[PDB]
Amino acid sequence: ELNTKIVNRGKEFFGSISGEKPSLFNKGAWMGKAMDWSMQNEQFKIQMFRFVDVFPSLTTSKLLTEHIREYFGNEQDMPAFMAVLNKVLTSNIEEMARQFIVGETTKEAVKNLEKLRKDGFAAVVDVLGEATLSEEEAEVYTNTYLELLEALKKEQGSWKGLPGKGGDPGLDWGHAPKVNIAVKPTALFCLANPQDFEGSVVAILDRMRRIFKKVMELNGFLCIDMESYRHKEIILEVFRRLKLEYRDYPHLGIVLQAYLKDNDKDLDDLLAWAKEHKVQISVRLVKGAYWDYETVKAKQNDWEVPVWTIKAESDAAYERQARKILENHQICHFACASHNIRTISAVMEMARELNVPEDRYEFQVLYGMAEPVRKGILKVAGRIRLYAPYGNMVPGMGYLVRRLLENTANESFLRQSFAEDAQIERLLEDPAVTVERERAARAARKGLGGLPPFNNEAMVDFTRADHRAAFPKHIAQVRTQLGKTYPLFINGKEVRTNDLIPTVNPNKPSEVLGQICQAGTTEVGDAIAAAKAAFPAWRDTDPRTRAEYLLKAAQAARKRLFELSAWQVLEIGKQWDQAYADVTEAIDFLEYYAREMIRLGQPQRVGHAPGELNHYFYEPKGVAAVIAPWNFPLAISMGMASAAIVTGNCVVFKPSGITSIIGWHLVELFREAGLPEGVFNFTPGRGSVMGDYLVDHPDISLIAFTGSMETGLRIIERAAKVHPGQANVKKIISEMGGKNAIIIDDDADLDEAVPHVLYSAFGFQGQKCSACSRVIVLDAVYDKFIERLVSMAKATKVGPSEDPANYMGAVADDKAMKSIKEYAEIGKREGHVLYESPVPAGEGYFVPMTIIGGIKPEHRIAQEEIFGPVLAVMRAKDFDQAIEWANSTQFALTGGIFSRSPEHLAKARREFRVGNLYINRNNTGALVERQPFGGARMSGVGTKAGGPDYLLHFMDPRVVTENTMRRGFAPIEEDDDWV
Amino acid sequence: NSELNTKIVNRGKEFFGSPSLFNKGAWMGKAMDWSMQNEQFKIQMFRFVDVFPSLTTSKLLTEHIREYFGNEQDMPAFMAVLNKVLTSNIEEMARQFIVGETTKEAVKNLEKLRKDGFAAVVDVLGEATLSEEEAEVYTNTYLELLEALKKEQGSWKGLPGKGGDPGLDWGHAPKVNIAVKPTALFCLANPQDFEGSVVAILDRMRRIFKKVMELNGFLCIDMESYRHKEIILEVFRRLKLEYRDYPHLGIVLQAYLKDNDKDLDDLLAWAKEHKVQISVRLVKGAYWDYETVKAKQNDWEVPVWTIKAESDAAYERQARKILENHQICHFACASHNIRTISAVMEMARELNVPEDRYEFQVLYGMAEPVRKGILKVAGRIRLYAPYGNMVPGMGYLVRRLLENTANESFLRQSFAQIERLLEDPAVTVERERAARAARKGLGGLPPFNNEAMVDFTRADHRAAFPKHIAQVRTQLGKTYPLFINGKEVRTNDLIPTVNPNKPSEVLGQICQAGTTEVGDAIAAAKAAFPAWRDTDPRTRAEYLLKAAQAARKRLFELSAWQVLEIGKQWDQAYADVTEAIDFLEYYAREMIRLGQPQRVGHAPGELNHYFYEPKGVAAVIAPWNFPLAISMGMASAAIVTGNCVVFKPSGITSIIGWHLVELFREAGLPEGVFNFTPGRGSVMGDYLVDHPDISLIAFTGSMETGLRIIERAAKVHPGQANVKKIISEMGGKNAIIIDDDADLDEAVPHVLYSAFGFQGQKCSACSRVIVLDAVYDKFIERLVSMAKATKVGPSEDPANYMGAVADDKAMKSIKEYAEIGKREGHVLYESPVPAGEGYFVPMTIIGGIKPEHRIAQEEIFGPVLAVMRAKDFDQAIEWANSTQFALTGGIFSRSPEHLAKARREFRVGNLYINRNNTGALVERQPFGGARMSGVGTKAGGPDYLLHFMDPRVVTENTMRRGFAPIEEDDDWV
Ligand SMILES: *[C]/[C]=[C]/N1=C2[C]=C([C])C([C])=[C]C2=N([C][C]([O])[C]([O])[C]([O])[C]OP([O])(=O)OP([O])(=O)O[C][C]2O[C](N3[C]=NC4=C3N=[C]N=C4[N])[C]([O])[C]2[O])C2=C1C(=O)[N]C(=O)[N]2
Ligand SMILES: C[C@@]1(S(=O)(=O)O)CC(=O)c2ccccc2C1=O
Ligand SMILES: C[C@@]1(S(=O)(=O)O)CC(=O)c2ccccc2C1=O
């Protein structure tokens, strides 16, 4: 019944449009021709849209000319509709951007808004801006709204209210405030992050409050826009708190997104909350702007995708939630925000059927698109408000790209109506019918040998209240477990020595976490003897059975995820996210290497001659020494040890002194898995006492080492000698340092480059082999890149990692703090200090977040690995010099480049020869399988952990060849070359 | 045709209207019936019968029964009770095919067969002939037999015929008829030494033939495997001409050989030319599976037809040709196939052939109804009657069982639609060919296949070596320069390279590189590197393919050089060049496979590509013992992966090293990518290894040198970009275990070859043979007796088994080791060597050796074999594992349990079961080991090229402004 009224409503709407197409679908216009070809040809769509994205950085004639050729080819190979060419492209693109923007200045915006009023349209005004990356940028954004409100304040008294059916003639349609603005919450705080939930809410709330107060001063409306899922809960809480501070002021709105599976509950909770507090609210319901982003993000982190994934589900959710809002019109004002005629028709007929007062609902569209839809709304619904952004053409271009993406999406109602000539009946169909049909249809990777395929363990997800509450609880629990003595673990038994070294909290060294027994050469010898005695039965254990112990250890760790993470926060000063990621990576190694050994464990027939069977397979070596670092104390230890173990070797394991308790987690995990005695032995000890003894020992066949170049090179040299009694040439697996650079090209997206560089340099205090310690910045973008990087750095806070508000904290120990501070002083004498953060007073191994510019390849801090929060900034005269400078060290571990030049990226792929090169993202945080990690030169020996070549380094191949012919007869085998 | 066929079909039906292994009432019938239904059981049963005569104790027998047939419960029903059940039954099955175990019994049973109307041709069962003494025993057994037959035949009444001499069989056939297996007369019969093999066999055959003629008897020369077919034909041709007036000499021809149409034509034309008479016994052929396997293993044309009806058609076609020529050629039809027999009978009638020009033969013990029928229908039937020891009687039994129960066997199919069975095989051929008419490469290239091995059954291959050796001798005396950056560079320091079998013969002079020239070569390689690294992997691979084709065209020439410069035997030389070709073909394909970047991970909004980069300059330090193969393997591997090479050949094989220069030059390899710098190790050895611009060292040679290189290269010098990657292959002290149940006819010649092939100068050579207590005396006597039959001398003469060792230095060192071993153990054999010049070390076998001894531990790299006596199989395994090396190993055993224990515990890089432990081929046997034998790299296999490269990953964030392209393999929605 209602559905039939909605369809006929939509039918009249299509009738009233008279076949008119929006400008983007007008094939008589240039933008229409461009979009037509983009919709026909996916490669051109990618070229064109990415070109419009980079366009605002093409600020010189050479940049512009080259990018045009790189994106679109030579003039002859362009489409017909496509230096003169610079002018025609520039003009058409600028014209498309102005289509969606009401002005570049406040004054121009105001004049144009008044034009729109005379044409019958209300407005909600938005300020365009690049991403806020600093406090000063947040202040500029805030002050622009204050400037806007002051201009509107002077003008609104002279505006006649838009015609209504009843109400107050001074107000739009008799009821709506004439001044309506919308603000993006994250633009008010550059470090908005649910990891610091309370801090983010407060920072945003404080600025929103200042804007709101001036909105209330002119009796205006403020809408709080909704952004990506990461900030949704923060944004809802900002709205709730501001609303309660001004419980009597009715003109405050929030956006809710119907594409979120969360939205049914979020809407219900918010209405119930409003009822409880006896307040009213306003909701602008949208479908949602970040669909592709949320799906990609969730898939990259193994989170549940937070959006519906069939487009009709979002439409059905919209009509469902709109009805809920309309039914609650008493407490909830409604803004329908959609360009979809079915959606709009649904809302109109539901409001009519529910007899909702017209002052409780209005319709909104984006300025400059769906033109015939906009005009149709005005005619049939009367009350229509245009979302009108204004400001700088740089963010204006990014906004344009997102509009073009939305208009030309395969699933777009506008594309289907105006490009594809879709049937009206199908366009106006009840989306619930659509959902069932596509759900039904959609009910129409694999693993091996009964095991699911490998997938990286889900990352900690601080959008969840339970994950946010888990860390303080588990840290507190860890604090009840302090003061213990950790013994050696040899041959399944605890062995105590009388040489104890305390392990302490680097953010609070007076806090002793425990006491670690130290192995002398006697005990190391016993560990080696136990591993050697366990080796024959372990080597003879079926590879599938050995893999099963890794799977059990992974499950044991998975059950203790937050607990194991909390130990790292305290013992080595990992931030919450850094600690959890260390534990998930350890789990990833276990799951991945288990699967790799199953794959590699089956002998393969090689060759195809009949009368003959050759089988090629692998054997372990013997006893492996595993010398692990403190910086990834569970992940890398577990990676090296489990690789050696699963391949059939037995392990003597020396954790780093300062993370010996984390090393004890390996004992716990392998013991819980029931690993046979002697296969894993835990022998922390003083390197000065037993370091060479372990490396030199005749019964060691393999050494896995991750650490400094000086130590790795020394081990490589010593391990090469063959001693009396020594059965094998020692196999060395050695990951050493990096002096990693990120290149910032002329056309880089600085909104992305700046925070990725800051995190690459200063995440975990710079204590990563992969960390960015050199940022090489192209001459023409240097001053503006540096200003933003430094201003963002200034917003960050340095302090204890157990407090999630801190960006980074103390370094590993007193020795590290002193070494790093000396490097900083050296660096300040080579270049010039750009930023040196405050650090907390009192105890703790704090090193300031430090940025030093004027650095050149000749300088020590351009060459030597500091392993701390010291970033060198280097000014390259051109891209050729940037590459040459990137390649000027003896290391080749990681590297990064931010660039949107196809030629520069191609050059970097080929010539920037690091083990792991990253394009347009941070150069840290390698994941198992996705980014197998390791390099050559002085960074290592070409082994890549977490990759499909890794396990072979811990084994040697064997071939068994059998002559199967007896008495002139051989069995035929399946793959035989025969007749 | 339809007329003749109709008569043939009708004659076939006559036979049918007119067999113990198919009798399911008897035990052998049941066992065979289950074999024909269950292939796993067939294999177990036939292999058990094969090993059975070696099961000489109660323990061996009991354990083998359980290992072959399982727990006496999971056994099929029809089968210490189980010990005696099998023993009596198997012995009974073997007796059905043998006319006696002694000459006296044979003769008496042969006389019984005569009174039953059957003629006979007598054959002497024997194990393989592995020595002159064994060849003499075999020969004298025939002489003993003939002597016994000579005294009986006058008393024999001729089988009744239609006319003629009543003192002759059927009126015309000699009453005494014997068959001899030619290779049983010479243990080293080998077409590689064609003339020597013909002469050795002919001399014994002549001795037998003279006694045959004295009795007015018939001698048939049997035909064996394809390897010896040409030798056997020539023996027949020579003996025939020596006694051109004596008509009773026959030869066997095999209709399953594609060669046979021409061989029969050739033989008939030969006989007409020489105006002699001949006799042919035409058979289908006994070695079908063997020839097919052997040809496929060596990449030779399969010499046999491979559709069974093709052999049947060939037989009828060739029988017709013989019968057309009945004037000059007597015919013996030898088939148990009723279609085949009926065809011969109607063809003989169609061509009006007199009955004294053809007869029918079957094997004693089978086709009894056929034999029953033949006698009634054809009247002239001769039984091929073997006699002798039960041991080779058992091997013969296995082969009889195999023939009877084959799917394609006329007998199995008959015991069935008669019209199908009696069909003209020509019709069957067309149908089957049509039905067949109704391994892939990659990127347009054929799949990898090992290069065809030299094939001395061919006259042209036998002629190629003396010819190419002569041509090489016209090119001696040259001075060989360095090759650096595409230019020849002369130095003043020259070292002669000489022939080790004849040191007065100087092959040329080799320029030596000083450190300055070595530095220049490294500099050239370094300068060439960037552009070579940036060359497309498919393009780099194309150069290897061009080099391989260049070598392929020079195969005999390249082989001849090795015969002279390092003393390779003909086969050893050719194999060295084919292996070089294999590496080129294989590594070219491996780089193409590895050359494409692969996406890793499946997360959307992201692309990770994983791929490989070369390292830089590689130093290649090559051995003399495989001077083209291993050199080319190491160098082409480094080159194809994008590195540039500085190559040091061994001093004494520097001319072979120069061949790498010629081959890469012919391929058009860019300058600097390959540089040739022979030099004195004391001058530039450490300089090369230590140089900071070297990123990889590929070495094959002694443990001592290899360990020194590993140690030195593990230092990183100032300006050194990388940790040096070491690819080092070092020695072996390789054992072959000879188990109680080993087949000694196989074990003996394989051990001899493994130990003394190329004078024992192989890293894979057998230098320890570990022999089980109960079979020790027996194995050692046969091994020593075979050794005694071999000759030591120049490798250019193919009559020699092995020759001089590499140089003066090697001879001295090996002789010191021989003396050490003689004090440690006891000499079992020590060959003569030629007098005069040449670096000759005797073929030396020493017994009494234990793991504690120096020659049980240290690599001698020469013709010195230690024989070690193990008390049980567990000790054999322990002793095999008692050295510091782990390169190759072998085991001769037919015990599933012992073989399984060896597969698990005999932990060498390449373990060989029931064959020699040398001769690894590319892809089939990737070669190399760990322990003190190497660093775990295997040349010629799928893990090898990665050792010359390092992986890189490029990771791209593909999302811009909220959108990322969907890629094919994305995890999506
Ligand atoms: C700053 C911001 C602002 N906002 C807004 C405001 C206004 C006034 C408006 C109008 C809007 C807005 N936004 C945006 C939105 O969201 C958009 O636009 C929408 O969504 C569009 O839609 P419509 O128009 O209704 O259309 P269509 O075509 O219908 O639809 C589309 C949609 O859907 C979805 N999807 C796709 N695909 C898919 C889906 N789902 C599921 N599945 C699948 N496959 C999406 O959503 C699209 O879009 C906004 C705002 C805020 O604040 N926030 C947000 O988020 N947004
Ligand atoms: C994220 C969006 S965008 O259009 O995709 O750029 C959402 C939106 O509707 C908007 C409207 C006006 C200005 C900016 C935006 C956005 O930031
Ligand atoms: C090689 C053969 S065997 O039967 O296959 O063993 C050929 C043959 O038919 C034969 C007949 C009588 C005695 C011995 C043999 C063989 O050695």
Side-chain angles (χ1 to χ4, degrees), chain A residues 100 124 126-129 182 184 225-228 257 284 286 288-290 339 366-367 369 387-390 395 398-406, chain B residues 961-962:
Chain A
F100 291 99
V124 40
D126 167 86
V127 167
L128 292 161
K184 310 294 187 162
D225 293 336
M226 185 57 74
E227 309 179 70
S228 77
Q257 301 153 320
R284 179 202 301 149
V286 301
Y290 310 86
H339 310 88
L366 297 179
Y367 175 87
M369 57 184 268
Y387 194 99
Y390 85 97
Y399 178 61
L400 170 60
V401 173
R402 293 181 64 98
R403 295 303 97 227
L404 301 178
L405 278 164
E406 188 48 71
Chain B
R961 210 48 71 172

Side-chain angles (χ1 to χ4, degrees), chain A residues 28-42 44-74:
Chain A
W30 186 93
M31 64 192 312
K33 292 190 170 63
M35 293 302 102
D36 185 35
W37 187 233
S38 298
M39 286 181 288
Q40 293 199 60
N41 190 278
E42 191 58 28
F44 182 79
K45 178 185 213 190
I46 295 174
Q47 294 169 28
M48 174 58 61
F49 289 19
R50 279 178 171 187
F51 179 79
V52 173
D53 175 54
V54 71
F55 181 74
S57 69
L58 309 181
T59 53
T60 66
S61 62
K62 170 180 173 275
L63 273 178
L64 181 51
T65 300
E66 295 173 342
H67 278 67
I68 290 168
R69 186 186 46 109
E70 288 170 43
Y71 277 75
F72 303 108
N74 302 119

Side-chain angles (χ1 to χ4, degrees), chain A residues 405-422 424-435 437-441 443-444 447-558 560-601 603-612:
Chain A
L405 278 164
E406 188 48 71
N407 275 267
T408 63
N410 286 303
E411 337 84 63
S412 167
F413 182 92
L414 298 173
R415 177 176 173 168
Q416 284 161 15
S417 293
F418 301 118
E420 312 283 328
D421 277 334
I424 270 56
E425 288 289 346
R426 163 66 181 90
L427 285 172
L428 299 180
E429 162 179 271
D430 187 340
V433 177
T434 314
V435 168
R437 173 170 65 254
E438 262 149 316
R439 275 184 178 169
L448 300 182
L451 286 186
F454 173 77
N455 252 297
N456 306 87
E457 170 80 21
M459 301 299 272
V460 65
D461 176 14
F462 292 125
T463 66
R464 305 172 53 164
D466 62 351
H467 286 197
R468 295 196 301 270
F471 265 94
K473 281 174 179 160
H474 279 93
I475 293 166
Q477 193 282 319
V478 160
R479 283 199 163 107
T480 72
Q481 300 302 306
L482 305 190
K484 297 178 207 259
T485 290
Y486 294 79
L488 317 179
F489 186 77
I490 298 167
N491 205 39
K493 295 129 189 127
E494 293 174 9
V495 174
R496 251 186 120 278
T497 69
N498 297 293
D499 183 14
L500 299 179
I501 297 174
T503 169
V504 306
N505 183 346
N507 281 291
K508 199 209 291 196
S510 64
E511 187 168 50
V512 178
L513 305 157
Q515 301 293 331
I516 316 292
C517 287
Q518 304 297 308
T521 59
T522 297
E523 291 81 17
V524 170
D526 294 335
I528 294 173
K532 186 185 181 176
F535 173 66
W538 183 241
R539 160 173 70 186
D540 280 346
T541 300
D542 143 65
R544 178 57 176 93
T545 301
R546 304 195 306 257
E548 178 68 16
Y549 290 105
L550 271 66
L551 298 177
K552 287 173 181 276
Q555 178 62 7
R558 199 179 281 113
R560 299 173 68 198
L561 251 160
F562 280 107
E563 175 199 351
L564 293 168
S565 298
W567 277 107
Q568 294 195 27
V569 171
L570 294 187
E571 196 181 27
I572 203 53
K574 290 266 185 183
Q575 292 68 34
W576 293 7
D577 60 303
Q578 306 286 304
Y580 199 96
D582 202 274
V583 186
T584 55
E585 181 177 355
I587 291 167
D588 284 350
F589 281 132
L590 292 165
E591 300 280 353
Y592 180 78
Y593 294 153
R595 282 167 179 76
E596 281 293 277
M597 193 64 246
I598 291 164
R599 178 177 69 84
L600 292 162
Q604 304 301 310
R605 181 187 180 185
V606 294
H608 302 260
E612 173 186 277

Side-chain angles (χ1 to χ4, degrees), chain B residues 478-486 488-498:
Chain B
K478 296 177 176 198
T479 297
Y480 296 75
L482 314 182
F483 193 71
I484 301 170
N485 209 19
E488 303 182 356
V489 173
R490 292 219 171 181
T491 67
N492 281 1
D493 184 23
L494 302 190
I495 301 186
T497 176
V498 308

Side-chain angles (χ1 to χ4, degrees), chain B residues 399-416 418-419 421-431 433-435 437-438 441-486 488-595 597-694:
Chain B
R399 308 194 44 117
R400 291 307 96 221
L401 295 181
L402 279 161
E403 190 58 68
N404 279 98
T405 56
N407 291 284
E408 341 80 42
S409 160
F410 186 85
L411 295 185
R412 177 187 173 155
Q413 299 179 28
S414 292
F415 310 115
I418 190 176
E419 292 291 330
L421 290 165
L422 298 177
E423 171 178 77
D424 186 333
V427 177
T428 318
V429 159
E430 284 312 291
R431 183 168 59 224
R433 276 181 182 183
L442 283 161
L445 289 182
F448 172 75
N449 251 282
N450 304 93
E451 174 72 25
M453 179 44 168
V454 66
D455 177 13
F456 292 124
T457 63
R458 300 169 55 171
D460 61 351
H461 285 201
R462 298 193 299 273
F465 267 93
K467 165 191 150 189
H468 283 274
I469 291 167
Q471 290 172 354
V472 162
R473 282 185 161 127
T474 70
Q475 311 174 49
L476 300 190
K478 296 177 176 198
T479 297
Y480 296 75
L482 314 182
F483 193 71
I484 301 170
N485 209 19
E488 303 182 356
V489 173
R490 292 219 171 181
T491 67
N492 281 1
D493 184 23
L494 302 190
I495 301 186
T497 176
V498 308
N499 182 342
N501 286 288
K502 195 212 240 128
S504 65
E505 179 166 52
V506 172
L507 291 81
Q509 304 288 337
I510 314 298
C511 291
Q512 307 297 304
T515 55
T516 297
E517 291 80 14
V518 170
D520 290 331
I522 293 175
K526 182 174 183 188
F529 175 63
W532 185 244
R533 165 174 69 186
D534 279 350
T535 294
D536 185 286
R538 179 59 182 92
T539 304
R540 302 197 304 258
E542 181 66 10
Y543 289 102
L544 272 66
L545 296 172
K546 285 177 180 181
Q549 177 58 21
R552 187 175 289 111
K553 283 147 65 165
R554 297 177 63 194
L555 251 161
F556 281 109
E557 171 202 351
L558 291 173
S559 302
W561 277 107
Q562 295 199 20
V563 176
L564 296 181
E565 198 187 24
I566 202 58
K568 292 266 187 182
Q569 294 69 32
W570 293 3
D571 59 312
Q572 301 292 299
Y574 200 95
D576 195 277
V577 184
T578 59
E579 178 168 54
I581 288 164
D582 285 350
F583 279 133
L584 291 168
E585 296 286 351
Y586 181 76
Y587 294 155
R589 284 163 178 79
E590 283 292 279
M591 188 67 241
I592 293 168
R593 175 182 73 83
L594 293 165
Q598 295 304 299
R599 177 179 184 188
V600 295
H602 317 260
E606 169 187 280
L607 284 176
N608 316 290
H609 288 95
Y610 187 114
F611 58 96
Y612 301 99
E613 292 267 351
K615 297 165 163 290
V617 187
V620 175
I621 296 163
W624 51 261
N625 73 323
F626 288 89
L628 192 67
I630 287 182
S631 301
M632 182 61 83
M634 294 190 292
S636 68
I639 286 163
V640 83
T641 47
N643 305 283
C644 299
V645 163
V646 176
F647 173 71
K648 187 191 183 302
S650 170
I652 66 182
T653 47
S654 293
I655 297 178
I656 316 308
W658 182 255
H659 292 156
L660 281 80
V661 176
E662 290 167 346
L663 294 169
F664 290 123
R665 265 176 133 175
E666 180 170 336
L669 192 75
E671 72 194 10
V673 178
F674 181 77
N675 308 274
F676 175 76
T677 58
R680 306 173 183 272
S682 62
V683 170
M684 48 58 74
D686 285 347
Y687 178 86
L688 172 61
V689 168
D690 299 340
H691 199 284
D693 282 328
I694 290 304

